[PDB]
Design a protein around this ligand. Structure first.
Ligand SMILES: CCCCCCCCCCCCCCCCCC(=O)OC[C@H](COP(=O)([O-])OCC(O)COP(=O)([O-])OC[C@@H](COC(=O)CCCCCCCCCCCCCCCCC)OC(=O)CCCCCCCCCCCCCCCCC)OC(=O)CCCCCCCCCCCCCCCCC
Ligand SMILES: CCCCCCCCCCCCCCCCCC(=O)OC[C@H](COP(=O)([O-])OCC(O)COP(=O)([O-])OC[C@@H](COC(=O)CCCCCCCCCCCCCCCCC)OC(=O)CCCCCCCCCCCCCCCCC)OC(=O)CCCCCCCCCCCCCCCCC
Ligand SMILES: CCCCCCCCCCCCCCCCC[C@@H](O)O[C@H](CO[C@H](O)CCCCCCCCCCCCCCC)COP(=O)(O)OCC[N+](C)(C)C
Ligand SMILES: CCCCCCCCCCCCCCCCC[C@@H](O)O[C@H](CO[C@H](O)CCCCCCCCCCCCCCC)COP(=O)(O)OCC[N+](C)(C)C
Ligand SMILES: CCCCCCCC/C=C\CCCCCCCC(=O)OC[C@H](COP(=O)(O)OCCN)OC(=O)CCCCCCC/C=C\CCCCCCCC
Ligand SMILES: CCCCCCCC/C=C\CCCCCCCC(=O)OC[C@H](COP(=O)(O)OCCN)OC(=O)CCCCCCC/C=C\CCCCCCCC
Lengths: 606, 175, 52, 64, 52, 56, 178, 459
């Protein structure tokens, strides 16, 4: 019965079996992580078949298998969309997850709760598939919040450490700010189009107004950490390195860009939202590439690189090229994950040290790690014929040949120079020169799990661009006519960034010491955004929620007006009424007054 | 299959092209499809055949329930409680049926949008027109009644709409 | 939970679906409009005589 | 114990109605209510006036 | 086992009240300073430096 | 020996007995509201050759 | 972290702390070892230039000036050891630390495994129960009438005494518990 | 529906005739059986209600509430038998008698066909609750809490009695079916405005509406655990049920009399959520959570749409389950350390892992993680409010962010960090506590599997 649907559903279904096995006698043994890794590899090789079917005949499907509940005119059903985006993203995500789980089998070997860690990673993967294949907005929101909660749990893995809990709560806060816009889009779409499912929404909105698209943009900015809501992603490096390689670099953080790619038919007919997306992406990529070039923690550098690449993805969406943005997501996953994996290898070898200022000459001490990191850096910088090139080169040359904001174009070019500059910094500082680490040398990368995982991701980072570019149907109109200088703009700016960073890193060898400028202080302290925005709003919010909401209103004035006033009045009148001396003279005089008043007041009027 | 009426849920005649191989290389999709067929579709078919064989030995029927038509809310006296109760029940049943009609039309629209692919804006004009018509009718009949709706409030809404239309028509006649 | 899962359809969801299918079939074939704006026949309604 | 008691039970006994207390209470307990009331009333009056004139584009608005 | 004389009280006026309050809060008398005596309800409790 | 068992666990029949008594009283209450049995315009029906009442 | 603090720091203590801070931040600025050695020797010469000032007022004025210069010229992102209070592994293993009293509530089946460990535990508990009163009385004797003035504790002095208040220092969980 | 009422009245002498050491067992078993029997009420119709007799009827709005009441009784029994171990046999039987009487009054309240009978039962629910709070509470504030609980309620409820008897003298009936069929619009006059206020304020104070909620933190903190469970899970929903019933006769006056209550609900929702961020007592935080969720329910009832009514029903059921679970979770720690201060006992995940899992699930349902019925109700209400006015999303949006913040603040403060060194009496979790948490949480997800059973009559 056209095995496409059955295979696409089995790929997602077999991922949940190790979750159902979490209360069996496999979860208490030391075979559980290998079991989960084998399950993920099997899921990947199974998902490879629907991809081949699509690449052969372009087949696409939607499956509404279960009818969950029905409203008066709205029907909600468990529905899966199996178009190009899903059937292309699922194998890439499964491949990356397989490599990262095999890496974690070595990186987290000394963790007493590795079984739980593997279960957690698997849970995140399931929620991401739910997000990616969802056909209606409620299912997509389920996946959205699932991956958010999974990232919260994985960031605070070391729950005895205060900073990890702070980073997890910060991630939740920013993603809730985005969730506001997600809910706004949901409410607008239901009250105006009468549906949450994707097919109906496209049909009823030929010219989509501003509000739903602005809500979608806010949600995407929250999930992909754009300039307004950026800081949580770098602070998410508090979790273990495998979490940073899988969730916060390649798969979970592209969710906002994927959400905008899903709703591209509506974004195609609104110029203002497109312009806002383009400008947001441009400022995000420039700001994060500028922050990355002066960071000393290697994980921070890779996190800022990921944020800048997300900004570039947003820019690509802003110029009405969603398929290029999707291709860039698929291309970036490989080398970003492998770069984080090499960083984790270096960190583990040097006794959990992350500062690049204490990393010496690892070019010779770490040959395979050096080779992998060099290949990943060259691919990230869009070196010709590599995986990065088949997306980033086209993105740059499509930004150049469009009617677009000029400032956005300038910031995109400066950011793509700063990318090469930051990549150069890691290589020069981490691999060249003389050792700076403690003298008890424990460097050892001879472990088959690490070698195999990084080798798989390296083959990906070398050949995936060519293979996937040649195996997809043309969904764009190519730019076949460019001035020669503009065709080489990306290469020229990359080379200039390379040379400038090399000069500025070579001058550190001189015996000259000068105090830093204000530009360096701005770049290193992330423009003072976390220093101000994490102190002023939080202080005012908490202080007002104590002084005014709790004390001034609830404990004082709301008490004062209704119950305290009643008690005071009743007590005063009780004292007035009950305090008589018991002398018959006084209240018999009172009786006389009452009798006289009564005859005239009520008796005279009959 | 024959499970549903193909007039209520229509589909185009399903034209699919024949395979035209142009390479000496084998097609991996065909080989994988043959493997999937022989390894999955046949045991499932045998299990279904066994289950249907067991089902045929125990056959029983359930019948769609029929309801007669009773007087509407218009043919009821002001305080007649029993006639009002029957009319309200009938009106509620008709409201449910209208909701299901709108549901059928929306299902048609969604299926058309998925089926037509990149040509959906032009190839699904008729379903969009039908949905617009049914949505307009349904909206006039039940929108703004709010919670605690009843047949009397629907009748009041219809009377107000008729009064407005009659006044508009008479004023346009004087033009 | 099993008892609640297998409760008989007293909400008449499937009955309403089948009734709507019959109605749509009948109205589509005859060329009649799928739905009517007025749910009550105007012949049984008596508007007030004067609107002035 | 002293901290929790001061934050909860010792507050009202040490409260005096002062110009500062009265002004802050009136402001922070009254101003938001009428601010939001004005906003919502204006929005709904505008929407109702648009509906009366028959120009709101309520097409496909089946569910409320 | 915390007696009622070990609980926060009203704003202290005489120096003897300030000494008793400082003894209650385990502070030196010259270190103890209450909040300003408005109607805020702070009362007896000491105003410590605003460092986190 | 069942004397002590009964005197220790006879409180276990009060609730089931209350349940069956409530069922009986509900049937009795339903018995007093048959003024429109087989008389509604929607469900009025000719009797079968054997049955006496359409519902109890 | 192990020594009881004093009521205040002295001038030489402050100078030594500033010297260590300045050297660390200079190493943060000077990544390479030879450059760091050069500028650290320069810093040491600068520090010991004014080592022989008999006027304490001018010494404190110089210390104030040096602290102001350090604050202006400090590294915004100085190097921190991974397990130091600002490092990447500061409190990483605190969630694995379990107090020893939790073992008192293990089910007897759990205690059936590890019999010798629990025998040693019983010996330790008996030791503590026997030494408590002697510890309390030694603290009572050695304490001045107006209460203790520092947080330093006396050691054991008698035949088989133990240093008072030792149980929770000796039975720390571990630095890498699990 | 005497097949449910009579077995509870039989629970009474079964408790008073049981042996001194079998009262808990007998009460729990027969309460669970009564809940199983009440499960049959979920078979509802699509057009009208189940009209059992002249006195009792079951709708699609009251059946889940009855099921929730009958299911809550055994959980309260399990939660109470720990701290009542030293009590005498007679006083334990009296406590169980109070709980049984409360269940009987609640069961009769949700099925009364007349408004005066509904009033009498909804007011009779006061005596057992007040007795429980003021007799079996722990601290001296329980007396003041009982006074606050009593008078806040009665000052709202007495004008309702006057309005009800007036309405019966005017229209000739208080039967709900007759009231619905013979409904007539309310004019715009001062008499009608005050009739509206008299018919609405009692249910408003029961929710409770912001500014009229001061009784709730006192009563819900000073009560014993079973008192808190039944106060948060069922007794707050009396206001919502009564308001959805009574609003049938209030149109079209509600169209503008709802404005002050709507503004109060939204802004006080923001305020109570903010109050939850700075709370030193763990139980008061849960109480203010209840206030925020009930403010949402008030908004939904006031805007008077089918989607808002569906959301209100779902949210009431979900909140009952979640808040009862949270109160039980806090009571476990209180029984361990005899203090309610939140920052006293920390790092409890190290000492009690399974209880930490229960904490995580409860706080995840509190913040309305999809596809829980908490989120179904919240999202339906938010959509209805957006249709009412597009600017509500801002206030609604702020509330969602704040709720997540304080829920995870509670979780991180209680479970993460490092365990306090001086506390060494934290014994392992008993089977009873784990079973209590499981019986709270499993029905929530089971109801998520089939959400039309809690969506009300407007479904
Ligand atoms: C041919 C056609 C195309 C033409 C393109 C343009 C042609 C010109 C070519 C030259 C381009 C730039 C070349 C280098 C630029 C500067 C390099 C540099 O590092 O300088 C050192 C110096 C600081 O050095 P330091 O702190 O001593 O060094 C640290 C130690 O060595 C400690 O060392 P460390 O280990 O910590 O390392 C520090 C680290 C980090 O170093 C820093 O801390 C400073 C970083 C500066 C580089 C920033 C570049 C991107 C700038 C984006 C600006 C966006 C707008 C900002 C708006 C701000 C508004 C307030 O250094 C690096 O890693 C390398 C830095 C980047 C090298 C590669 C640069 C490539 C991008 C630029 C070239 C683009 C080429 C292609 C262009 C294509 C165009 C189509 O920074 C500067 O002074 C220059 C930065 C430029 C800032 C100007 C902003 C204006 C300031 C005045 C404001 C006036 C206000 C008016 C009134 C306002 C009232 C409201
Ligand atoms: C989604 C996967 C589908 C799997 C298929 C089969 C699932 C069967 C699950 C049945 C229901 C779970 C029972 C709840 C009580 C927990 C049991 C327990 O006490 O642990 C002892 C037990 C013994 O191990 P242990 O060594 O003693 O560990 C104890 C320590 O405390 C250490 O314990 P721990 O560190 O291992 O943590 C315990 C665990 C367990 O704690 C929990 O939080 C589990 C409860 C779920 C969250 C509840 C509130 C959220 C509202 C969502 C409502 C969904 C319910 C749907 C209806 C379910 C009907 C039962 O918490 C977590 O690991 C992470 C929780 C975060 C979950 C994020 C996912 C969000 C929603 C994703 C999609 C949901 C809808 C699916 C369909 C969507 C469209 C296709 O622990 C386990 O064996 C692991 C628990 C299994 C994890 C389940 C998480 C995913 C399932 C979600 C609902 C099921 C959906 C089924 C539909 C098919 C799709
Ligand atoms: C500890 C280890 C945990 C992990 C290991 C677990 C291993 C796997 C087990 C988990 C199961 C996965 C769930 C997946 C869903 C499958 C079940 C589903 O298909 O059944 C639903 C049915 O679910 C039930 O309907 C919902 C259960 C009812 C919940 C009521 C709770 C019981 C009362 C308890 C007290 C009440 C308190 C609350 C008061 C309101 C389908 O509904 P429906 O579409 O129709 O069925 C169509 C066909 N029918 C109609 C012929 C039957
Ligand atoms: C702390 C929390 C407590 C709970 C909150 C309870 C909320 C109660 C608020 C009542 C809502 C509205 C009540 C009356 C409806 C309109 C109010 C009035 O201001 O509107 C105008 C009324 O005009 C003037 O305002 C006259 C009223 C002025 C005197 C009222 C005293 C208000 C002062 C505030 C006292 C605080 C009251 C609450 C005590 C706690 C409308 O003009 P008009 O068309 O002519 O009157 C309509 C009625 N008609 C049609 C019969 C004529
Ligand atoms: C376990 C192994 C079982 C092996 C033997 C079973 C083999 C096939 C069994 C076929 C059973 C027959 C069957 O399922 O038919 C459909 C039957 C009834 O039709 P409905 O769609 O429910 O009608 C509308 C009522 N809502 O549906 C079912 O009962 C099966 C549904 C299972 C769905 C798959 C799991 C997804 C649900 C996860 C819960 C998610 C929570 C809510 C999600 C919201 C999504 C918007
Ligand atoms: C016109 C008449 C209207 C009458 C309205 C009366 C409302 C009913 C509440 C009566 C409360 C009386 C309390 C009182 O007067 O005494 C103050 C009392 C003194 O304490 P005692 O117990 O008397 O002394 C013991 C130690 N020596 O102070 C208190 O602390 C009282 C604590 C409980 C008060 C609770 C009142 C809550 C009222 C809620 C609002 C509704 C009030 C009633 C009117 C509502 C508005 C229409």
């Amino acid at each position: 019965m056209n095995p496409f649907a059955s295979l696409t559903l089995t790929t997602l279904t077999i991922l949940t079996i190790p979750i159902m096995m979490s209360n069996s006698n496999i979860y208490k043994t030391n075979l559980y992580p290998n079991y989960v890794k084998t399950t993920v590899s099997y899921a990947f090789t199974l998902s490879l078949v629907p991809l081949l079917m699509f690449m052969h005949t372009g087949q696409e499907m939607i499956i509404s298998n279960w009818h969950w509940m029905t409203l008066q005119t709205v029907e909600l059903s468990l529905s899966f969309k199996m178009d190009y985006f899903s059937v292309m993203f699922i194998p890439v995500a499964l491949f990356v997850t397989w490599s990262i789980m095999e890496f974690s089998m070595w990186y987290m070997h000394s963790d007493p709760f590795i079984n739980r860690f593997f279960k957690y990673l698997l849970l995140f993967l399931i929620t991401m598939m739910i997000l990616v294949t969802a056909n209606n907005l409620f299912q997509l929101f389920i996946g959205w919040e699932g991956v958010g909660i999974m990232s919260f749990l994985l960031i605070g893995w070391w729950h005895g450490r205060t900073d990890a809990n702070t980073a997890a709560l910060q991630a939740i806060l920013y993603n809730r700010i985005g969730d506001i816009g997600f809910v706004l889009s949901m409410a607008w779409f239901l009250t105006h189009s009468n549906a949450w499912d994707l097919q109906q929404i496209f049909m009823l909105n030929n010219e989509c107004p501003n509000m739903p698209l602005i809500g979608l943009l806010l949600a995407a900015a929250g999930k992909s950490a754009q300039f307004g809501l950026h800081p949580w992603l770098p602070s998410a490096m508090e979790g273990p390195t495998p979490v940073s390689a899988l969730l916060h670099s390649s798969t979970m953080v592209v969710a906002g860009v994927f959400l905008l790619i899903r709703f591209y038919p509506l974004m195609e007919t609104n110029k203002l939202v497109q312009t806002m997306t383009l400008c947001l992406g441009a400022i995000t990529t420039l700001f994060t590439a500028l922050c990355a070039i002066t960071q000393n923690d290697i994980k921070k550098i890779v996190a800022f690189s990921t944020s800048s690449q997300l900004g570039l993805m947003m820019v690509t969406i802003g110029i009405n090229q969603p398929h290029l943005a999707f291709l860039h997501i698929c291309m970036h996953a490989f080398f970003k994950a492998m770069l984080f994996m090499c960083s984790g290898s270096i960190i583990h070898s040097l006794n959990d040290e992350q500062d690049i200022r204490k990393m010496g000459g690892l070019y010779k001490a770490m040959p395979f790690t050096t080779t992998a990191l060099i290949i990943g850096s060259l691919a990230l910088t869009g070196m010709p014929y590599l995986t990065g090139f088949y997306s980033k080169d086209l993105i740059i040359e499509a930004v150049n040949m469009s009617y677009t904001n000029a400032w956005a174009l300038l910031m995109t070019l400066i950011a793509t120079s700063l990318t090469a500059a930051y990549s150069t910094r890691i290589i020069f500082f981490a691999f060249l020169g003389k050792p700076r680490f403690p003298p008890l040398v424990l460097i050892n990368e001879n472990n088959p799990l690490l070698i195999n995982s990084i080798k798989r991701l390296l083959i990906g980072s070398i050949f995936a661009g060519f293979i996937i570019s040649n195996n997809i149907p043309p969904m764009t109109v190519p730019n076949t006519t460019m001035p020669l200088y503009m065709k080489m703009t990306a290469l020229i700016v990359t080379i200039m960034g390379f040379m400038l960073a090399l000069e500025l890193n070579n001058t550190t060898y001189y015996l000259k010491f000068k105090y830093p400028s204000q530009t360096y202080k701005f770049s290193n302290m992330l423009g003072y955004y976390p220093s101000i925005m994490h102190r002023l709003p939080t202080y005012h919010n908490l202080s007002m929620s104590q002084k005014s909401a709790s004390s001034l209103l609830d404990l004082i004035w709301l008490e004062t007006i209704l119950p305290k006033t009643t008690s005071f009045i009743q007590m005063k009148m009780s004292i007035m009424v009950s305090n008589q001396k018991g002398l018959i003279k006084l209240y018999f005089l009172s009786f006389l007054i009452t009798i006289m008043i009564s005859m005239t007041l009520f008796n005279y009027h009959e | 299959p024959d499970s549903w009426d193909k007039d209520v849920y229509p589909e185009p005649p399903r034209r699919t092209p024949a395979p035209a191989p142009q390479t000496s290389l084998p097609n991996p999709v065909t080989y994988l499809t043959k493997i999937f067929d022989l390894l999955v579709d046949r045991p499932v078919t045998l299990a279904r055949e066994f289950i249907e064989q067991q089902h045929a030995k125990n056959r029983y029927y359930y019948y769609h329930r029929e309801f007669r038509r009773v007087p509407d809310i218009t043919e009821c006296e002001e305080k007649d409680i029993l006639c009002m109760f029957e009319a309200e029940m009938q009106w509620r049943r008709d409201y449910k049926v209208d909701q299901e009609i709108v549901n059928i039309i929306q299902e048609r629209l969604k299926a058309c949008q998925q089926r037509e692919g990149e040509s959906y804006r032009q190839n699904c004009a008729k379903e969009l027109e039908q949905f617009t018509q049914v949505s307009k009718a349904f909206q006039d009949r039940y929108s703004d009644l709010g919670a605690h709706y009843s047949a009397r409030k629907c009748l009041a809404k219809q009377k107000q709409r008729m009064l407005a239309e009659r006044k508009a028509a008479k004023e346009a006649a004087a033009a | 939970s099993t008892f609640v899962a297998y409760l008989p359809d007293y909400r008449m969801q499937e009955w309403a679906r089948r009734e709507a299918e019959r109605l749509v079939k009948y109205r589509e074939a005859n060329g009649l409009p799928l739905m009517e704006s007025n749910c009550f026949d105007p012949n049984k309604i008596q508007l007030p005589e004067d609107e002035d | 114990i002293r901290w929790t008691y001061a934050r909860s039970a010792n507050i009202y006994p040490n409260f005096r109605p002062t110009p500062k207390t009265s002004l802050l209470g009136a402001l922070f307990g009254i101003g938001p209510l009428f601010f939001w009331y004005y906003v919502f009333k204006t929005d709904r009056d505008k929407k109702e006036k648009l509906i009366q004139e028959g120009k709101l584009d309520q097409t496909f608005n089946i569910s409320y | 086992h915390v007696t009622k004389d070990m609980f926060p009280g009203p704003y202290p006026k005489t120096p003897e009240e300030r000494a008793a309050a400082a003894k209650k809060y385990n502070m030196r008398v010259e270190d103890y300073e209450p909040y300003p005596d408005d109607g805020m309800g702070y009362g007896d409790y000491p105003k410590l430096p605003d460092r986190s | 020996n069942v004397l002590q068992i009964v005197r220790d666990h006879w409180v276990h029949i009060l609730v089931p007995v209350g349940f069956v008594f409530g069922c009986y009283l509900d049937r009795r209450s339903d018995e007093k509201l048959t003024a429109f049995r087989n008389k509604s315009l929607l469900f009025k029906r000719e009797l079968r050759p054997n049955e006496e009442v359409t519902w109890k | 972290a192990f020594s009881a603090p004093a009521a205040y720091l002295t001038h030489q203590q402050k100078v030594l702390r500033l010297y260590k801070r300045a050297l660390r931040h200079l190493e943060s600025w000077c990544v390479h070892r030879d450059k760091y050695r050069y500028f650290a020797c320069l810093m040491r010469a600068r520090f010991d230039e004014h080592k022989n000032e008999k006027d304490m007022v001018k010494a404190t004025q110089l210390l104030r000036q040096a602290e102001e210069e350090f604050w202006y010229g400090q590294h915004p992102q100085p190097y921190i050891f991974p397990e130091s209070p600002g490092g990447t592994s500061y409190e990483r293993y605190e969630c694995y630390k379990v107090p020893e009293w939790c073992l008192d509530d293990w089910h007897p089946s759990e205690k059936a495994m590890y019999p010798d460990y629990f025998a040693k535990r019983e010996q330790w508990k008996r030791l503590r129960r026997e030494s408590w009163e002697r510890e309390v009385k030694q603290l009572q004797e050695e304490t001045p009438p107006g209460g203790p003035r520092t947080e330093a504790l006396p050691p054991a002095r008698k035949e088989g005494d133990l240093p008072p208040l030792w149980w929770h220092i000796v039975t720390r969980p571990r630095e890498r518990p699990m | 529906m005497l097949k449910i009422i009579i077995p509870t009245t039989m629970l009474l002498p079964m408790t008073w005739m049981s042996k001194h050491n079998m009262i808990w067992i007998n009460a729990t078993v027969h309460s669970l059986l009564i809940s199983l029997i009440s499960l049959s009420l979920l078979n509802q119709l699509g057009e009208n209600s189940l009209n059992f007799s002249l006195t009792f009827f079951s709708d699609s709005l009251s059946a889940p509430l009855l099921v929730l009441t009958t299911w809550l009784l055994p959980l309260m029994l399990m939660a109470s038998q720990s701290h009542l171990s030293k009590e005498t046999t007679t006083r334990k039987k009296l406590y169980i008698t109070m709980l049984i009487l409360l269940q009987l009054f609640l069961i009769m309240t949700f099925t009364a066909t007349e408004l005066i009978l509904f009033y009498i039962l909804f007011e009779a629910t006061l005596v057992p609750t007040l007795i429980i709070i003021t007799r079996w509470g722990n601290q001296t504030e329980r007396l003041n809490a009982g006074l606050y609980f009593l008078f806040y309620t009665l000052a709202g409820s007495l004008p309702l009695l006057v309005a009800l008897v007036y309405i019966q003298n005017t229209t000739g009936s208080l039967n709900f079916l007759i009231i619905h069929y013979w409904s007539h619009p309310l004019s715009n006059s001062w008499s009608n405005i005050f009739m509206w206020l008299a018919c609405i304020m009692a249910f408003m104070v029961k929710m409770p509406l912001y500014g009229l909620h001061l009784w709730l933190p006192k009563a819900h903190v000073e009560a014993p655990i079973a008192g808190s469970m039944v106060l948060a899970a069922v007794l707050l929903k009396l206001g919502g049920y009564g308001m959805m019933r009574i609003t049938t006769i209030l149109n079209p006056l509600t169209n503008y009399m709802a404005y002050p209550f709507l503004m109060l609900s939204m802004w006080g929702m923001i305020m109570t959520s903010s109050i939850c961020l700075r709370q030193t007592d763990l139980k008061s935080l849960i109480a203010y959570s209840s206030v925020s969720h009930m403010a949402l329910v008030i908004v939904a009832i006031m805007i008077q749409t089918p989607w808002s009514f569906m959301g209100a029903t779902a949210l009431m059921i979900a909140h009952g389950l979640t808040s009862s679970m949270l109160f039980c979770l806090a009571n476990t720690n209180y029984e361990r350390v005899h203090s309610r201060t939140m920052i006293l006992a920390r790092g409890l995940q190290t000492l009690l892992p399974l209880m930490a899992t229960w904490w995580l699930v409860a706080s995840l349902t509190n913040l309305a993680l999809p596809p829980s019925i908490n989120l179904i109700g919240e999202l339906f209400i938010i959509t209805a409010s957006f249709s009412w006015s597009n600017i509500t999303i801002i206030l609604m949006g702020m509330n969602m962010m704040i709720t997540a913040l304080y829920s995870l603040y509670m979780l991180i403060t209680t479970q993460r960090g490092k365990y306090t060194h001086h506390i060494n009496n934290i014994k392992p979790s008993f089977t009873r506590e784990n079973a209590l948490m499981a019986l709270h949480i499993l029905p929530l997800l089971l109801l998520t599997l089939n959400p039309k059973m809690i969506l009300g009559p407007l479904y």
